[PDB]
Amino acid sequence: NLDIIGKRIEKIKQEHETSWHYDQDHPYKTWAYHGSYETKQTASSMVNGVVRLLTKPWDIIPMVTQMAMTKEKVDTRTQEPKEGTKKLMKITAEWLWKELGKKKTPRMCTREEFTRKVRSNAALGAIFNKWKSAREAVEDSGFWELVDKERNLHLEGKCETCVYNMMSRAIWYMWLGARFLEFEALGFLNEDHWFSRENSLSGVEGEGLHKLGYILRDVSKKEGGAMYADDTAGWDTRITLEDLKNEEMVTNHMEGEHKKLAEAIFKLTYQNKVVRVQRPTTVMDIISRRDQRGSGQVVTYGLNTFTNMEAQLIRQMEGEGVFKSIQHLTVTEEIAVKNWLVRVGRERLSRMAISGDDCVVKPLDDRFASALTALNDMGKVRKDIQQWEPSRGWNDWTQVPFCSHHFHELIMKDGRVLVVPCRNQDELIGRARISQGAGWSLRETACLGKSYAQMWSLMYFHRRDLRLAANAICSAVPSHWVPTSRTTATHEWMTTEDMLTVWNRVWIQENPWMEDKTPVESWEEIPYLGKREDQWCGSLIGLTSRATWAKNIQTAINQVRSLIGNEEYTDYMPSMKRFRR
Numbered sequence: 340n341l342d343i344i345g346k347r348i349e350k351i352k353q354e355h356e357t358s359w360h361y362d363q364d365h366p367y368k369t370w371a372y373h374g375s376y377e378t379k380q381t382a383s384s385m386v387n388g389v390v391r392l393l394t395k396p397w398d399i400i401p402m403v404t405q406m407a408m409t410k411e412k413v414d415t416r417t418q419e420p421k422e423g424t425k426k427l428m429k430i431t432a433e434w435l436w437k438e439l440g441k442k443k444t445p446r447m448c449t450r451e452e453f454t455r456k457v458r459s460n461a462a463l464g465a466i467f468n469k470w471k472s473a474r475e476a477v478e479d480s481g482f483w484e485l486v487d488k489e490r491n492l493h494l495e496g497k498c499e500t501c502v503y504n505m506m507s508r509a510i511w512y513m514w515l516g517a518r519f520l521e522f523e524a525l526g527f528l529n530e531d532h533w534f535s536r537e538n539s540l541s542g543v544e545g546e547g548l549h550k551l552g553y554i555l556r557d558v559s560k561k562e563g564g565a566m567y568a569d570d571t572a573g574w575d576t577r578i579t580l581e582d583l584k585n586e587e588m589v590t591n592h593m594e595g596e597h598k599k600l601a602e603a604i605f606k607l608t609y610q611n612k613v614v615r616v617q618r619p620t621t622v623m624d625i626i627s628r629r630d631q632r633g634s635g636q637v638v639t640y641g642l643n644t645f646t647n648m649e650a651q652l653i654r655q656m657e658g659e660g661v662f663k664s665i666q667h668l669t670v671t672e673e674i675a676v677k678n679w680l681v682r683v684g685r686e687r688l689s690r691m692a693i694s695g696d697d698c699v700v701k702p703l704d705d706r707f708a709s710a711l712t713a714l715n716d717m718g719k720v721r722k723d724i725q726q727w728e729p730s731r732g733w734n735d736w737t738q739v740p741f742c743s744h745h746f747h748e749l750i751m752k753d754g755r756v757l758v759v760p761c762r763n764q765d766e767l768i769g770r771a772r773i774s775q776g777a778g779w780s781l782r783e784t785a786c787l788g789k790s791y792a793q794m795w796s797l798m799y800f801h802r803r804d805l806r807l808a809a810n811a812i813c814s815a816v817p818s819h820w821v822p823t824s825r826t827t828a829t830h831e832w833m834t835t836e837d838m839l840t841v842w843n844r845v846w847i848q849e850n851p852w853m854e855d856k857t858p859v860e861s862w863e864e865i866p867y868l869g870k871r872e873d874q875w876c877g878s879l880i881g882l883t884s885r886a887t888w889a890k891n892i893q894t895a896i897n898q899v900r901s902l903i904g905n906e907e908y909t910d911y912m913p914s915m916k917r918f919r920r
């Protein structure tokens with residue numbers, strides 16, 4: 340307790356000595372409260388005018404328009420798992436780190452790699468003070484002396500400045516220094532692709548939205564039961580102290596400085612936390628707790644993937660009868676569990692697609708559906724179903740939800756097969772109409788519209804309305820202006836290369852599921868969903884509003900071109916049959 344967190348609390352207390360007071364009307368029950376102090380401040384979603392002016396029919400669709408308008412799960416407790424459950428988790432975690440470590444070497448990430456990340460806008464979840472932005476702190480030796488002070492404090496097993504700032508979500512921003520030390524010790528999990536499909540068998544890290552459907556269809560080819568895709572209620576809030584201890588076992592594979600720097604991240608920042616939260620009653624509360632997930636988002640993704648892979652192997656073990664009860668594992672069940680892992684563990688990992696808290700599992704048979712005792716006792720309670728009601732599985736891989744999508748099998752006029760990503764079109768148009776942050780020039784807004792358009796041309800070309808709207812936006816933005824994002828899966832649409840050339844590289848040349856590498860010569864060779872299927876997935880094809888928009892699209896394009904000014908533009912609309920004379 341206070342021996343590990345006191346120094347951080349001590350230090351904050353003294354910076355606000357004028358305002359320190361143990362408030363008695365504090366709303367916390369499961370967080371340890373320490374004190375309050377005086378502050379006064381808060382970032383709403385802004386509309387992208389370029390995308391909205393080129394999507395006029397959606398101006399009267401509430402599911403689109405409402406998306407641009409506008410903490411009692413975080414303050415709850417998880418119970419300690421039973422002895423049998425704790426044993427299953429420890430054995431599985433030990434085995435899984437070894438498998439992930441067979442073809443990989445843990446190593447520290449560098450000031451250089453960090454500096455390079457900050458000098459190309461990656462969402463590192465830092466705060467604004469002594470320097471303005473991340474870019475300036477990184478180009479100043481004073482910062483690195485603060486980093487050095489904390490670094491030597493961590494080697495000594497102590498912490499002074501690694502404090503979270505809070506803001507079914509919750510983001511835990513830290514100062515750039517604490518983010519660096521996290522990246523130095525644990526960045527290797529992401530930087531060296533520990534959760535690639537080649538390395539982890541269940542994982543999809545780095546795979547890309549154009550691969551995920553082919554991956555689900557490959558899982559579907561295994562003999563076994565339904566495909567299960569159960570969502571956890573508030574995954575980050577159900578991470579137990581036993582989970583954080585199994586995750587820390589990655590340090591058993593390290594040596595030297597690295598092993599000590601990693602052990603300190605887990606001990607001092609993950610298994611003990613100090614957090615500052617804004618309460619309108621506007622004060623700042625300094626609260627602490629031992630469990631739950633609260634790391635950088637990239638480390639969070641890898642450890643969520645690890646603990647989810649572990650949890651789902653155990654649910655598979657329960658379905659297969661490898662153990663009888665979570666109350667207690669007998670000596671001979673331990674050897675049975677170890678022996679299952681060695682004998683079939685790698686086959687069972689290949690039956691899964693796991694993206695952090697998101698999973699799809701094709702178990703050996705449907706006993707999995709009612710195998711709930713370990714899952715519930717680990718705290719991974721399913722969303723939108725009663726605790727002991729059996730899971731409903733999916734009979735067709737094309738119906739399974741994964742990473743906010745479903746996937747269609749689409750047959751090209753020439754016989755070849757595309758497996759394409761899809762989701763309700765209102766969600767796609769509603770997201771592309773939104774920007775985050777202040778000070779957007781018209782050029783920067785246009786280049787963000789262009790990024791959405793090129794993503795649509797690469798991933799959603801099969802949706803009639805999105806191929807047309809993508810062509811219109813790319814026609815309305817100057818041809819040489821470079822697509823941008825402020826927050827940055829593989830992003831092959833982020834390029835000034837011709838989108839037909841990129842489509843050929845992604846869907847034909849580099850597609851390991853496409854045997855015939857004959858390039859496509861025009862967009863007209865690239866198919867759409869059935870018209871009825873496109874309507875089912877939210878198309879406006881068939882509406883009078885949509886017909887007028889498609890017919891008059893050159894008028895909309897010219898409206899945006901007149902706003903941007905006398906720049907060099909390309910007409911991409913004749914790449915479509917209906918605008919081709």
Ligand SMILES: CCC(=O)NCc1nnc2n1CCCC2
Pocket residue numbers: 897898900901904905906
């Ligand atoms: C009508 C929309 C367009 O193509 N761009 C607007 C625009 N702004 N100055 C000029 N133009 C076009 C060419 C003449 C000079």
Ligand SMILES: [Zn+2]
Pocket residue numbers: 489493497498499500501607
């Ligand atoms: Zn620290």
Ligand SMILES: [Zn+2]
Pocket residue numbers: 745747761762876
């Ligand atoms: Zn669809």
